[PDB]
Amino acid sequence: DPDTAVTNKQSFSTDVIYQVFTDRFLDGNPSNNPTGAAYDATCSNLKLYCGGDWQGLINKINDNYFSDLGVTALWISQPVENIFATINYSGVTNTAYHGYWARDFKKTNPYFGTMADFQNLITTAHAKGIKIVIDFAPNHTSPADAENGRLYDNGTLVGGYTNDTNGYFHHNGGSDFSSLENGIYKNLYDLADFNHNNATIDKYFKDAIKLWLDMGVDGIRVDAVKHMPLGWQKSWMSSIYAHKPVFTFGEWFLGSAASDADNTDFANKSGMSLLDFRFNSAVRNVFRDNTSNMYALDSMINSTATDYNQVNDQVTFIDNHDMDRFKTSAVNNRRLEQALAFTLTSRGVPAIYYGTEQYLTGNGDPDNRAKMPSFSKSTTAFNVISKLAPLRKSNPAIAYGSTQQRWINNDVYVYERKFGKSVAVVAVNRNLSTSASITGLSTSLPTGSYTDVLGGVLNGNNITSTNGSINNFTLAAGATAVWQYTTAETTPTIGHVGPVMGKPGNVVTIDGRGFGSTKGTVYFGTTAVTGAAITSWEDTQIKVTIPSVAAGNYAVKVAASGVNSNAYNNFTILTGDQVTVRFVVNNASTTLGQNLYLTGNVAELGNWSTGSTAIGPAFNQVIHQYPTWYYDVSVPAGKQLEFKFFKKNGSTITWESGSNHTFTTPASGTATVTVNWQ
Ligand SMILES: [Ca+2]
Ligand SMILES: [Ca+2]
């Protein structure tokens, strides 16, 4: 199957994601709409249910609204049963229309549809080459008070937030958001926090997602990743990747293109991507708010490409469920159109929040979750997506391409996306009133005459190369032209690998060009993977079995016909199955600004390193207070580990003295190991 094929659940780079609040799209079946106050036909009270369902989505798929738009994957609201009750925050009746207040992760939300409806929707999407991505919010249940934040395991009850004897939840009050630990271990407002170190919860959630992947979901958009321990998440991911690997991204909110240490961290160590708020901010500051210029935009591109191990897996967007719509009264259509184009031709997996093609407005929650107004295919923005979306599939330079600043200034940007012998050039002039005389533009386009892929719908123009040298031209006011160049690759050149972390035995997908149809050999580091280990092999996609080599960070290489492909770095190989173990050290007092890390005899703790590979810095305030620190780590299961803490501050490392501490991990689930600092 090609990298392109709907089948490719491990890579979304060639797709376009359509984010849609299920309830706010189409009530394709009235026979399942809420009754009474908890419902509102008009859908004027955005806080109540409006009727949207899975049949509605099915209908749109079937009349090619999506197929005409160009979107290749739907991102739906969480499908699980949510609380049936209603909460009255400040006199206003609030419903769980959003999907985010789960009560039974093992049952479908009746208001969206049934299990068979869901199955019906998973089959109809694949038939048209559309993938389905789902929201999964394992952080918490529903707001305490609605239903005492109860959780049912497929009907049967697990426990409520109150008189929670076995401790399935956290009872440390709610997060004031003053630190990463305060956000992880304390509730989100009234949202009942689950205690993941609790083993039945750890297993409830591995068992839950398993069910959904089993039914055919193609990707999972995890919610509130900054509110759950990394260690746990990673372990959960290894469970998923070991069963049915699927593209997983999470939401870790940021408020700028500004780099963030914990953000970049999670993005490179959890085993899942993030939503690109750094990008979003720059895309909005330049195109929307007029608070930064093309420089800011370019500066973001280089920096993100530099911070994230695999920038191509981040998920770009111009707006979403947690912000003001891109469109407002001062923002004009061309500007929306420009942001879309910029995003569709950009690096990463892009997502369009529902109704952007219909210029929908709505500032803040919930006005930005208005009902889908039209199914019009005429808008210019609708046009732009249909034109461009298809390119991610046809041109691999858009999909896996690098980015090169080829001409820039305050209003004008011309960047280059190139992968192997393929290219795409994109010129953007955010100035709505004055055009720009471009002189001395240089690209990698072979000599020839190029026609703006956008047929001029965004005042685009044609160009002419002369061995990369483009002839002098004028870029009209508010223009944006795209000129590409494609050809058959003849050299194994790796474009993606999914997932990027796993234990030996798992199956990974390598996407790219020029692999030929004759099984060569894979290279996990310096270890050739051949023959039967290579489950599948064709020009654009090779499915290969992760060899059983020492856990660690490898680079992947595909050698087709003796020619070695380029190397895909930072591919993480696990020791084996994981379990989440909480490490607690006592009397581990420190000096001002001195911190506590952890490392031991397995790649998962960092193989005795004191660097960027050691676990930490351990927490010291919510679950355990200073001088006791603690930190939840993903760690090989069943195996006996040796570990040791260490304080680190200026540059100087002080290891605990005496022998190494020891712990033989549990064969499954979770565990806690307490130790005294030596
Ligand atoms: Ca309905
Ligand atoms: Ca939490």
Contact 617, 623 (CB under 8 A): no
Is residue 221 annotated as involved in ligand binding? yes
Contact 600, 657 (CB under 8 A): no
**Number of helical H runs and strand E runs in the chain:** 13, 40
- Expressed in angstroms and rounded, the spacing between residue 443 Cα and the centre of ligand 2 is 48
Phi and psi (nearest 5°) for 102? -60, 150
Active-site annotation holder among 15, 23, 104, 251 = 251
- Expressed in angstroms and rounded, the spacing between residue 181 Cα and the centre of ligand 2 is 9
d(CA 155, CA 231): 29
Characterize the bridge pairing of strands 17-19 and 349-353.
parallel
Is residue 82 annotated as involved in ligand binding? no
Is residue 226 annotated as involved in ligand binding? yes
d(CA 330, CA 352): 21
Return the closest-CA partner of residue 228 out of 260, 270, 291: 270
Instruction: Give the ligand at the shortest distance from the Cα of 59.
Output: 1
Q: Which residues pair with 403 in a beta bridge?
A: 417
The domain 1-394 is placed in CATH, from the list 3.40.50.300, 1.20.1740.10, 3.20.20.80, 3.30.230.10, at 3.20.20.80
Is residue 140 annotated as involved in ligand binding? yes
- Expressed in angstroms and rounded, the spacing between residue 341 Cα and the centre of ligand 2 is 37
Burial (Cβ within 10 Å: 0-12, 13-18, ≥19) of residue 217 = buried
User: Residues of CATH 2.60.40.1180 domain(s) within the chain?
Assistant: 395-488
What are 165's two structure tokens?
Answer: 């004897």
Instruction: Give the ligand at the shortest distance from the Cα of 111.
Output: 1
> Is there a cis peptide before residue 350, judged by omega within 30 degrees of 0?
no
Burial (Cβ within 10 Å: 0-12, 13-18, ≥19) of residue 165 = exposed
Contact 112, 58 (CB under 8 A): no
Method: X-ray
- Expressed in angstroms and rounded, the spacing between residue 61 Cα and the centre of ligand 1 is 16
Angle at 580 between CA 210 and CA 631, to 5 degrees: 140
Q: Which residues contact 361 (CB under 8 A, 6 or more apart)?
A: 325, 327, 328, 329, 367, 370
Return the closest-CA partner of residue 269 out of 525, 547, 553: 553
DSSP 8-state symbol, 637:
S
Is residue 33 annotated as involved in ligand binding? yes
Contact 460, 387 (CB under 8 A): no
Query: Resolution reached, in Å?
Result: 2.6
Return the closest-CA partner of residue 341 out of 446, 424, 247, 463: 424
Extract long-range pairs of 189-193: CB within 8 Å, 24+ residues apart: 189/143, 190/143, 190/144, 190/145, 191/101, 191/139, 191/140, 191/141, 191/142, 191/143, 191/144, 191/149, 192/140, 192/141, 192/142, 192/143, 192/144, 192/149, 192/161, 193/139, 193/140, 193/169, 193/227
Radius of gyration for the chain, computed over Cα atoms and rounded to the nearest angstrom? 25
Is residue 189 annotated as involved in ligand binding? yes
d(CA 663, CA 580): 13
Q: Which fold has domain 489-574?
A: Immunoglobulin-like (2.60.40)
Contact 559, 21 (CB under 8 A): no
d(CA 24, CA 133): 17
Q: Does domain 395-488 have CATH number 3.40.50.300?
A: no
d(CA 392, CA 398): 6
Active-site annotation holder among 104, 181, 223, 307 = 223
- Expressed in angstroms and rounded, the spacing between residue 24 Cα and the centre of ligand 1 is 10
Which 3 state secondary structure label does DSSP give 86? coil
- Expressed in angstroms and rounded, the spacing between residue 450 Cα and the centre of ligand 2 is 52
Is residue 218 annotated as involved in ligand binding? no
The residue type found at 113 is: G
Is residue 153 annotated as involved in ligand binding? no
What are 262's two structure tokens?
Answer: 């914990």
- Expressed in angstroms and rounded, the spacing between residue 186 Cα and the centre of ligand 2 is 6
User: Residues of CATH 3.20.20.80 domain(s) within the chain?
Assistant: 1-394
Is residue 104 annotated as involved in ligand binding? no
Phi/psi class of residue 148: alpha, beta or left (left: φ > 0; alpha: ψ in -120 to 50)?
Answer: left
Contact 511, 578 (CB under 8 A): no
- Expressed in angstroms and rounded, the spacing between residue 264 Cα and the centre of ligand 2 is 20
Contact 203, 638 (CB under 8 A): no
Output the 3-class SS for 478-513: CCEEEEEECCCCCCCEEEEEECCEECCCCEEEEEEE
User: Residues of CATH 2.60.40.10 domain(s) within the chain?
Assistant: 489-574, 575-678
Burial (Cβ within 10 Å: 0-12, 13-18, ≥19) of residue 593 = exposed
Instruction: Give the ligand at the shortest distance from the Cα of 31.
Output: 1
User: Helix H segments across 537-640?
Assistant: none
Q: Name which CATH class applies to 575-678.
A: mainly beta
Characterize the bridge pairing of strands 156-159 and 151-153.
antiparallel
Instruction: Give the ligand at the shortest distance from the Cα of 22.
Output: 1
- Expressed in angstroms and rounded, the spacing between residue 201 Cα and the centre of ligand 2 is 13
| Torsion angle of the four alpha carbons 211, 229, 103, 246, in this order, in degrees rounded to the nearest 10 | -30
Instruction: Give the ligand at the shortest distance from the Cα of 109.
Output: 1
223 is catalytic: yes
